[PDB]
């Protein structure tokens, strides 16, 4: 599967000027665009080589979408403060994520469009992309508003049409990096804690995309209980890192194997210290 995903954040700051608006876009786990209303020169900026060579009119068009979106999100922040009757001195956050997914088919699989206010679910297009789900009475005002203007018809048109056309174009132009998987580079470390206890750590570095499964097994059966996983983290170069740790009785290390599963591995990996 492949996906294109956008993330919008808008934050009010009463007495410090108009709310800041930040947008980022991704294809799979690769960022390709950013906009920041607070930037020195606010405009759409490339973050990947396969959109760098898009022309100045493409960039001019994207920049005007963001400036227009930033203005609309400042209005929504002021409306939302009224719906909840909040003080005008507090800072508030409005977030939106939307995107489209291609199936193994290469054809459209799903789309989505969801909103949050102050970190909590606010309103969302349902999976059919035809109806809304409102989290509370304030969001019902927005739902009544949006369905009166057939907003869902407009969003479905983009998610099922324009979004897939861009994603396909991006996948073609950036195929050297977007349609390759880089397998994890692995190793196992051991740390004795006590006479009765030791810890095994299984490392995965430099892999793309970010999805990976690290499982510790004892005598071949998976032991998800005693294992400790870190959050997958960015290396900063476009690849990702992760480790899984298990506490084992000292002396029994050879009965433990780490199972690594990644799109870049032709067959799963069995690692032993």
């Amino acid at each position: 599967s492949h996906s294109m995903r956008y993330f919008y954040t808008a934050v009010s700051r009463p007495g410090r000027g108009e709310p800041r608006f930040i947008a980022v876009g991704y294809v799979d786990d690769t960022q390709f665009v950013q906009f920041d209303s607070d930037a020195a020169s606010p405009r759409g900026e490339p973050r990947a080589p396969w959109v760098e060579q898009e022309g100045p009119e493409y960039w001019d068009r994207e920049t005007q979408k963001y400036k227009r979106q930033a203005q609309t999100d400042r209005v929504s922040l002021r409306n939302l403060r009224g719906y909840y009757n909040q003080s005008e001195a507090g800072s508030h956050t409005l977030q939106r994520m939307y995107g489209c997914d291609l199936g193994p088919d290469g054809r459209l699989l799903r789309g989505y469009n969801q909103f949050a206010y102050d970190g909590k679910d606010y309103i969302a297009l349902n999976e059919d992309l035809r109806s809304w789900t409102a989290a509370d009475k304030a969001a019902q005002i927005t739902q009544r508003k949006w369905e009166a203007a057939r907003e869902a018809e407009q969003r479905r048109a983009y998610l099922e049409g324009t979004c897939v056309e861009w994603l396909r174009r991006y996948l073609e132009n950036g195929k050297k990096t977007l349609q390759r998987a880089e397998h994890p580079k692995t190793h196992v470390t051991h740390h004795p804690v006590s006479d009765h206890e030791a810890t095994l750590r299984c490392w995965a570095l430099g892999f793309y995309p970010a999805e990976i499964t690290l499982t510790w097994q004892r005598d071949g059966e998976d032991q998800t209980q005693d294992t400790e996983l870190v959050e997958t983290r960015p290396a900063g170069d476009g690849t990702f890192q992760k480790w899984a740790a298990v506490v084992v009785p000292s002396g029994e290390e050879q009965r433990y194997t780490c199972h690594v599963q990644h799109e870049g591995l032709p067959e799963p990996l069995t690692l032993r210290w």
């Binding site: 609309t72 999100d73 606010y122 203007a149 907003e151 407009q154 983009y158 324009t162």
Partner: peptide
């Protein structure tokens, strides 16, 4: 390619 701008909340 970003979505067009719709209605405020």
């Amino acid at each position: 390619g970003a979505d067009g701008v719709g209605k405020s909340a």
